[PDB]
Tab-separated table of C-alpha atoms and ligand atoms in Angstrom:
chain	number	residue	atom	x	y	z
A	187	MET	CA	14.760	22.953	0.554
A	188	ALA	CA	11.429	21.534	1.705
A	189	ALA	CA	11.063	21.252	5.468
A	190	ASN	CA	10.193	17.559	5.044
A	191	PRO	CA	13.370	15.771	3.867
A	192	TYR	CA	11.409	12.751	2.568
A	193	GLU	CA	9.478	14.650	-0.120
A	194	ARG	CA	10.211	13.256	-3.593
A	195	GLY	CA	8.945	14.374	-6.983
A	196	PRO	CA	6.966	17.417	-8.100
A	197	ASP	CA	3.803	18.640	-6.439
A	198	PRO	CA	1.035	16.104	-7.176
A	199	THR	CA	-2.141	16.588	-9.182
A	200	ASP	CA	-5.175	14.417	-9.823
A	201	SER	CA	-3.852	14.073	-13.371
A	202	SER	CA	-0.371	12.980	-12.306
A	203	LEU	CA	-1.748	10.358	-9.900
A	204	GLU	CA	-4.286	8.986	-12.412
A	205	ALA	CA	-1.587	8.641	-15.080
A	206	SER	CA	-0.145	5.259	-15.976
A	207	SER	CA	3.292	6.301	-14.683
A	208	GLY	CA	4.740	8.699	-12.154
A	209	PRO	CA	7.702	11.033	-12.603
A	210	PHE	CA	10.438	8.441	-11.945
A	211	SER	CA	11.767	5.983	-14.507
A	212	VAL	CA	11.655	2.447	-13.116
A	213	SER	CA	14.185	-0.391	-13.179
A	214	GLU	CA	13.559	-3.969	-12.107
A	215	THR	CA	15.537	-6.880	-10.700
A	216	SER	CA	14.485	-10.191	-9.193
A	217	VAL	CA	15.253	-12.458	-6.253
A	218	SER	CA	14.968	-16.208	-6.685
A	219	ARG	CA	12.892	-18.499	-4.494
A	220	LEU	CA	16.144	-19.992	-3.196
A	221	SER	CA	17.746	-16.651	-2.320
A	222	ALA	CA	14.536	-15.402	-0.655
A	223	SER	CA	14.819	-16.484	2.971
A	224	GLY	CA	11.302	-16.898	4.333
A	225	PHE	CA	9.323	-16.218	1.144
A	226	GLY	CA	9.001	-17.466	-2.404
A	227	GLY	CA	11.027	-14.888	-4.299
A	228	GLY	CA	9.885	-11.718	-5.957
A	229	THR	CA	10.430	-8.947	-8.456
A	230	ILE	CA	11.845	-5.657	-7.167
A	231	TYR	CA	10.809	-2.428	-8.909
A	232	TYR	CA	12.817	0.660	-8.041
A	233	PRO	CA	13.376	4.231	-9.236
A	234	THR	CA	16.485	4.298	-11.391
A	235	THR	CA	17.475	7.675	-10.013
A	236	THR	CA	18.948	8.164	-6.547
A	237	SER	CA	19.583	11.918	-6.860
A	238	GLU	CA	16.760	13.039	-4.535
A	239	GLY	CA	17.622	10.620	-1.713
A	240	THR	CA	16.573	7.195	-0.531
A	241	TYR	CA	13.004	5.911	-0.735
A	242	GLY	CA	10.586	4.007	1.415
A	243	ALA	CA	9.981	0.362	0.568
A	244	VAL	CA	6.784	-1.626	0.074
A	245	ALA	CA	6.195	-5.390	0.032
A	246	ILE	CA	3.091	-6.684	-1.772
A	247	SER	CA	1.541	-10.145	-1.370
A	248	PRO	CA	-0.799	-11.953	-3.780
A	249	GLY	CA	-3.757	-14.016	-2.630
A	250	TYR	CA	-4.784	-17.656	-2.401
A	251	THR	CA	-3.685	-19.792	-5.389
A	252	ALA	CA	-2.125	-16.711	-7.015
A	253	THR	CA	1.371	-15.599	-7.987
A	254	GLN	CA	3.178	-12.340	-8.684
A	255	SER	CA	1.510	-11.913	-12.063
A	256	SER	CA	-1.757	-11.062	-10.291
A	257	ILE	CA	-0.173	-8.023	-8.579
A	258	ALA	CA	2.596	-7.195	-11.041
A	259	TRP	CA	1.104	-3.946	-12.349
A	260	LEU	CA	1.451	-2.328	-8.915
A	261	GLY	CA	5.241	-2.602	-9.084
A	262	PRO	CA	5.890	-0.069	-11.836
A	263	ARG	CA	2.835	2.013	-10.918
A	264	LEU	CA	3.958	2.654	-7.342
A	265	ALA	CA	7.725	2.610	-7.894
A	266	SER	CA	7.383	5.328	-10.544
A	267	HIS	CA	6.208	7.738	-7.818
A	268	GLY	CA	9.275	7.133	-5.654
A	269	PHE	CA	9.174	3.794	-3.839
A	270	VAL	CA	11.069	0.512	-3.859
A	271	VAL	CA	8.456	-2.206	-4.343
A	272	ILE	CA	8.764	-5.991	-4.121
A	273	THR	CA	5.938	-8.151	-5.465
A	274	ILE	CA	6.485	-11.491	-3.762
A	275	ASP	CA	5.569	-15.073	-4.420
A	276	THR	CA	4.675	-17.026	-1.302
A	277	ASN	CA	6.288	-20.265	-0.143
A	278	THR	CA	3.222	-22.065	-1.498
A	279	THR	CA	0.177	-20.689	-3.278
A	280	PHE	CA	-2.017	-22.205	-0.530
A	281	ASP	CA	-0.420	-20.258	2.343
A	282	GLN	CA	-2.953	-18.740	4.759
A	283	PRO	CA	-3.159	-15.047	5.699
A	284	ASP	CA	-1.056	-15.188	8.876
A	285	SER	CA	1.670	-17.049	6.973
A	286	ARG	CA	1.611	-14.366	4.265
A	287	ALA	CA	2.051	-11.742	6.995
A	288	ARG	CA	5.338	-13.335	8.045
A	289	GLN	CA	6.470	-13.520	4.413
A	290	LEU	CA	5.742	-9.836	3.824
A	291	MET	CA	8.036	-9.008	6.740
A	292	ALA	CA	10.682	-11.463	5.512
A	293	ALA	CA	10.587	-9.730	2.123
A	294	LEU	CA	11.113	-6.328	3.749
A	295	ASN	CA	14.007	-7.782	5.758
A	296	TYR	CA	15.568	-9.055	2.524
A	297	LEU	CA	15.134	-5.689	0.787
A	298	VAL	CA	16.689	-3.678	3.624
A	299	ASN	CA	19.561	-6.026	4.445
A	300	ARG	CA	20.505	-8.182	1.454
A	301	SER	CA	19.035	-6.932	-1.836
A	302	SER	CA	21.137	-5.307	-4.544
A	303	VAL	CA	19.026	-2.139	-4.132
A	304	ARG	CA	19.251	-1.909	-0.328
A	305	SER	CA	21.300	1.295	-0.657
A	306	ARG	CA	18.267	3.038	-2.220
A	307	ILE	CA	16.004	2.281	0.762
A	308	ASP	CA	15.413	4.172	3.994
A	309	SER	CA	14.978	1.188	6.298
A	310	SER	CA	12.969	3.267	8.796
A	311	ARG	CA	10.123	3.801	6.269
A	312	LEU	CA	8.428	0.557	5.248
A	313	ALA	CA	4.938	-0.499	4.198
A	314	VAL	CA	2.902	-3.608	3.378
A	315	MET	CA	0.177	-4.246	0.801
A	316	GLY	CA	-1.599	-7.329	-0.468
A	317	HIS	CA	-4.556	-8.767	-2.321
A	318	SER	CA	-7.217	-11.036	-0.811
A	319	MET	CA	-5.539	-13.407	1.646
A	320	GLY	CA	-2.525	-11.173	1.038
A	321	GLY	CA	-4.654	-8.311	2.308
A	322	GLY	CA	-5.463	-10.335	5.389
A	323	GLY	CA	-1.737	-10.870	5.804
A	324	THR	CA	-1.281	-7.111	5.448
A	325	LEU	CA	-3.596	-6.515	8.414
A	326	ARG	CA	-1.788	-9.114	10.516
A	327	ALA	CA	1.622	-7.718	9.560
A	328	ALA	CA	0.409	-4.259	10.586
A	329	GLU	CA	-0.897	-5.582	13.905
A	330	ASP	CA	2.354	-7.388	14.757
A	331	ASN	CA	4.798	-4.732	13.449
A	332	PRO	CA	3.658	-1.293	14.645
A	333	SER	CA	6.834	0.362	13.307
A	334	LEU	CA	5.432	-0.027	9.782
A	335	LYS	CA	4.509	3.324	8.261
A	336	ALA	CA	1.495	2.209	6.205
A	337	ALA	CA	-0.660	-0.782	5.271
A	338	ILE	CA	-2.987	-1.158	2.287
A	339	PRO	CA	-5.201	-4.287	2.270
A	340	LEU	CA	-6.780	-4.783	-1.170
A	341	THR	CA	-10.140	-6.650	-1.161
A	342	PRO	CA	-8.860	-8.405	1.972
A	343	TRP	CA	-9.870	-11.860	3.197
A	344	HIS	CA	-9.340	-13.026	6.779
A	345	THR	CA	-11.208	-15.109	9.339
A	346	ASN	CA	-10.206	-12.684	12.105
A	347	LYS	CA	-12.544	-9.676	12.034
A	348	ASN	CA	-11.061	-7.778	15.012
A	349	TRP	CA	-8.115	-5.495	14.176
A	350	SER	CA	-8.576	-3.120	17.103
A	351	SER	CA	-4.854	-3.214	17.977
A	352	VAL	CA	-3.651	-1.911	14.597
A	353	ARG	CA	-1.667	1.308	15.091
A	354	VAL	CA	-0.329	1.579	11.513
A	355	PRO	CA	-2.103	3.949	9.073
A	356	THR	CA	-4.340	1.632	7.072
A	357	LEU	CA	-6.267	2.136	3.836
A	358	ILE	CA	-8.668	-0.725	3.076
A	359	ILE	CA	-9.920	-0.983	-0.508
A	360	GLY	CA	-13.088	-3.006	-0.982
A	361	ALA	CA	-14.994	-4.094	-4.093
A	362	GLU	CA	-18.713	-3.339	-3.950
A	363	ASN	CA	-19.784	-6.556	-5.714
A	364	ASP	CA	-17.113	-8.830	-4.196
A	365	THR	CA	-18.482	-12.360	-3.760
A	366	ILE	CA	-15.186	-13.953	-2.617
A	367	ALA	CA	-14.381	-11.617	0.296
A	368	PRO	CA	-17.730	-9.800	0.614
A	369	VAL	CA	-17.203	-6.334	2.048
A	370	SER	CA	-20.056	-6.900	4.517
A	371	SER	CA	-18.145	-9.775	6.151
A	372	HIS	CA	-14.497	-8.824	5.477
A	373	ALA	CA	-13.408	-5.320	4.441
A	374	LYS	CA	-16.039	-3.361	6.369
A	375	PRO	CA	-15.813	-5.335	9.650
A	376	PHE	CA	-12.035	-4.896	9.365
A	377	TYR	CA	-12.326	-1.135	8.886
A	378	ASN	CA	-14.911	-0.708	11.649
A	379	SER	CA	-12.697	-2.534	14.162
A	380	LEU	CA	-9.655	-0.349	13.468
A	381	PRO	CA	-9.175	2.264	16.228
A	382	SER	CA	-10.397	5.750	15.380
A	383	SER	CA	-7.072	7.007	16.795
A	384	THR	CA	-5.218	5.237	13.959
A	385	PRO	CA	-5.228	7.148	10.640
A	386	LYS	CA	-7.471	5.086	8.403
A	387	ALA	CA	-9.711	5.064	5.355
A	388	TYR	CA	-12.142	2.741	3.603
A	389	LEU	CA	-12.464	3.073	-0.185
A	390	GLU	CA	-15.098	0.989	-1.962
A	391	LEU	CA	-14.839	0.464	-5.714
A	392	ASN	CA	-18.195	0.985	-7.417
A	393	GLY	CA	-19.451	-2.115	-9.210
A	394	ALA	CA	-16.175	-3.972	-8.750
A	395	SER	CA	-15.396	-7.673	-8.385
A	396	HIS	CA	-12.818	-9.372	-6.159
A	397	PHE	CA	-10.362	-9.280	-9.072
A	398	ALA	CA	-10.362	-5.527	-9.656
A	399	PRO	CA	-6.926	-5.309	-7.939
A	400	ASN	CA	-5.386	-7.763	-10.451
A	401	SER	CA	-5.609	-5.385	-13.444
A	402	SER	CA	-4.472	-1.792	-13.902
A	403	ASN	CA	-6.970	0.339	-11.981
A	404	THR	CA	-6.786	4.136	-11.957
A	405	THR	CA	-8.565	4.464	-8.602
A	406	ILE	CA	-6.490	1.866	-6.745
A	407	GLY	CA	-3.299	3.421	-8.083
A	408	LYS	CA	-4.284	6.987	-7.245
A	409	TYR	CA	-5.284	6.394	-3.631
A	410	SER	CA	-2.581	3.804	-2.943
A	411	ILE	CA	0.042	6.311	-4.103
A	412	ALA	CA	-1.493	9.094	-2.010
A	413	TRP	CA	-1.642	6.862	1.064
A	414	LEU	CA	1.969	5.707	0.776
A	415	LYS	CA	3.163	9.254	0.088
A	416	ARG	CA	1.266	10.696	3.040
A	417	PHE	CA	2.399	8.111	5.580
A	418	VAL	CA	5.593	6.490	4.312
A	419	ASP	CA	7.035	9.887	3.269
A	420	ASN	CA	5.074	12.042	5.763
A	421	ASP	CA	4.235	13.961	2.577
A	422	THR	CA	1.347	16.284	3.412
A	423	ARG	CA	1.135	17.465	-0.199
A	424	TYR	CA	-0.978	14.299	-0.614
A	425	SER	CA	-3.469	15.086	2.165
A	426	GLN	CA	-5.529	16.964	-0.436
A	427	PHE	CA	-6.452	13.683	-2.151
A	428	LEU	CA	-7.266	11.781	1.043
A	429	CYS	CA	-9.055	14.659	2.815
A	430	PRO	CA	-10.276	16.987	0.053
A	431	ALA	CA	-11.629	20.400	1.008
A	432	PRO	CA	-12.406	23.700	-0.744
A	433	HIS	CA	-9.215	25.234	0.674
A	434	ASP	CA	-7.279	22.990	-1.744
A	435	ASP	CA	-8.309	25.706	-4.252
A	436	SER	CA	-5.541	28.288	-4.542
A	437	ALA	CA	-8.213	31.017	-4.439
A	438	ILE	CA	-9.439	29.912	-0.981
A	439	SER	CA	-7.124	30.518	1.968
A	440	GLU	CA	-9.469	28.955	4.557
A	441	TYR	CA	-12.685	26.938	4.532
A	442	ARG	CA	-14.681	25.814	7.575
A	443	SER	CA	-18.096	24.190	7.675
A	444	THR	CA	-20.486	21.926	9.557
A	445	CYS	CA	-20.219	19.324	6.768
A	446	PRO	CA	-21.481	16.795	5.956
A	447	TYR	CA	-24.809	18.103	4.658
B	91	LIG	NA1	-6.076	27.321	-0.743
């Protein structure tokens, strides 16, 4: 048995992470707006199998004026690698980022305590993600809830630029040609303010618009999966994608250098 009891699925490859689906078949259920205390409802995507143990859970928020359909593809994509994922609707489509932060946490509370799939979740291993204002809410949720295992803001928007108290491993994905949340005034200031003592990464999508996260995207899927695996599951098999090095080659037992050059 692996030393890490949270490892799920076979050893990853670039190919397996760029594929449309991971190794786990995915089921889905929903929670109504009425039943969702503190948020607007959502769709829950979960691995059908339970035979390898419980999974971490992820709540995902859409952005301003948007609904679940703008983030729906992430549900099956991420759940098929071994996560329980809820794509939420917000109380109103005009909710601001700090409101969306509270709703992300309310959705995780629902999943862990009241959902029909709560028995498939390890409640000690939770994460937040979101698009646009939902990505701003992801940063605020991470700042206010340091027990979270990971946070992934996608083309985030927020008026607060200072996230120097965030102690949750955070991957920010920006869009090079974003004109709605320009990376020069949102994503990059956010990343630069994060403490260097917090595990973090900034990934910028070449040529991309603000709406790249709303359609199936091989790059977003690959690095989102690797981030959640590495930090929600403590799965160091995924370090190779986040921190590539020649020693990832099976022919190379050690590689040291004064890179970059
Ligand atoms: Na090696």
